[PDB]
């Protein structure tokens, strides 16, 4: 069976496109898996002692888009915290939830096709007894087959 999506419905019922169907579409366009994300900070996140408030940060985890508007994340004292994006589709009211974990617990669960909770790290927060010492964001992997390019600039290495 072939399920068509980017096509018009004359009787307005023929080709309906859902959250998971578009989610799979977005993943293919950017070239991401369930282990990587697309993250952009429109405004730098504030650090208040053992807490991290994301002022305005948009995240695409598993092809699912969501905005963090002044969302504070609780941190562990004198430890290297790993901020994870948790997507549980069963929670119809609040599917996305955040958590600061001891280690990188990225599961890579296929949520668009199968069941489960998707966990993926996006920000690493190093803390002391008082407050935040340093922050490092998780690399945004872009898996591609072949590239036809004019010019390129590399800051790290090939």
């Amino acid at each position: 069976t072939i399920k068509n999506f980017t096509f018009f419905s004359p009787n307005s019922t023929e080709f309906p496109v859902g959250s998971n169907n578009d989610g799979k579409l977005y993943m293919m366009l950017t070239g991401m898996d369930y282990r990587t994300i697309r993250r952009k900070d429109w405004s730098s996140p504030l650090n208040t002692a053992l807490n991290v408030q994301y002022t305005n940060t948009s995240i695409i985890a598993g092809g699912r888009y969501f905005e963090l508007l002044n969302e504070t994340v609780a941190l562990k004292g004198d430890s290297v915290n790993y901020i994870h994006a948790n997507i549980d589709l069963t929670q119809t009211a609040n599917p996305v939830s955040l958590s600061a974990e001891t280690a990188n617990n990225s599961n890579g669960v296929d949520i668009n096709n199968g069941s489960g909770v998707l966990k993926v790290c996006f920000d690493i927060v190093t803390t002391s007894g008082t407050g935040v010492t340093s922050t490092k964001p998780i690399v945004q992997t872009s898996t591609l087959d072949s590239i036809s390019v004019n010019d390129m600039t590399v800051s790290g290495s090939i």
């Binding site: 096509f7 018009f8 004359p10 307005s12 309906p16 496109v17």
Partner: protein
């Protein structure tokens, strides 16, 4: 109600004198056989039967031809006028018409009889035999189909509406269903549903010196045959006929008819037999087609 037989000199043509053989002065009565015969090539080994390929044979059609003149002069004038009109054209098209169907046969004059056993006012009772070229073929009118844009509905379609800066909701079953396409008027399908053998398509070209003609696509979007012509000036219309017996290709400009066969693309025109799929117009503003597909028994 009742059955209507008609004899045509040039069916699908302008110079078509029609003879109403059911109604008119010259009449066709008691057809010999309108059915069919088939040779199935069934060979049997040890009681079990194996079937080959069935050659669907068509038998001659013999009519009781009666004339209805008013004098001996009038009946002789009918026999001479009718039989010579059949002889003038290499093949004569018959029309089988009833309440339910209208089919055609391309008979070739096999045998006509003339005897001196005259009924009242020199009337005639004679047998006319025909040989069959094609037995039962429909002459349907082929036209393109247009595609229409689906209506826009709030909540069901893809629009950013209501409270600013717009909102479209994902729902189970309702979600977002696209309305249509910007300039949907660009999609036109000339649909081919059954296999055709010959056709009489009038095609008006758009631009001179650009290859003008029709191409045919199969069910998977691959081209099999294309009648493609290249012209120096714009011929008001190209009058192509695919009939095998009187194949006609001609580009009309004004009152002058020009033969377009040597200027046609021989590589692209692979077959005459049109398969299930669609037809595309190359360098054509407008086209009027008349499709003629088979029917073994009717």
């Amino acid at each position: 109600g009742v059955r209507q037989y008609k004899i045509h000199t040039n069916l699908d043509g302008t110079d078509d004198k029609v003879w109403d053989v059911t109604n008119g002065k010259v009449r066709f009565y008691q057809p010999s056989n309108l059915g069919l015969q088939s040779t199935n090539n069934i060979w049997q080994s040890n009681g079990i039967g194996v079937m080959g390929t069935r050659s669907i044979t068509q038998p001659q059609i013999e009519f009781k031809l009666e004339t209805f003149g008013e004098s001996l002069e009038e009946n002789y004038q009918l026999m001479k006028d009718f039989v010579n009109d059949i002889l003038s054209k290499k093949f004569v098209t018959l029309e089988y018409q009833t309440e339910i169907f209208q089919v055609y046969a391309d008979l070739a004059l096999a045998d006509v009889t003339k005897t001196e056993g005259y009924g009242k006012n020199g009337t005639f009772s004679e047998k006319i035999t025909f040989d069959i070229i094609t037995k039962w073929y429909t002459y349907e009118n082929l036209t393109f189909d247009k595609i229409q844009n689906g209506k826009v509905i709030a909540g069901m379609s893809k629009i950013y509406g209501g409270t600013a800066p717009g909102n479209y909701k994902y729902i189970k079953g309702t979600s977002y269903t696209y309305y249509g396409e910007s300039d949907i008027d660009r999609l036109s399908r000339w649909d081919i549903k059954e296999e055709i053998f010959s056709f009489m398509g009038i095609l008006y070209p758009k631009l001179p010196k650009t290859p003008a003609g029709v191409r045919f696509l199969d069910d998977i979007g691959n081209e099999y045959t294309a009648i493609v012509f290249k012209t120096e000036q714009v011929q008001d219309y190209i009058l192509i006929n695919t009939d095998v017996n009187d194949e006609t290709y001609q580009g009309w400009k004004g009152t002058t008819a020009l033969n377009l066969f040597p200027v046609m693309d021989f590589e692209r025109y692979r077959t005459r037999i049109i398969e299930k799929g669609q037809m595309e117009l190359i360098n054509l503003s407008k086209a009027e087609f008349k499709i003629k597909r088979k029917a073994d028994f009717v």
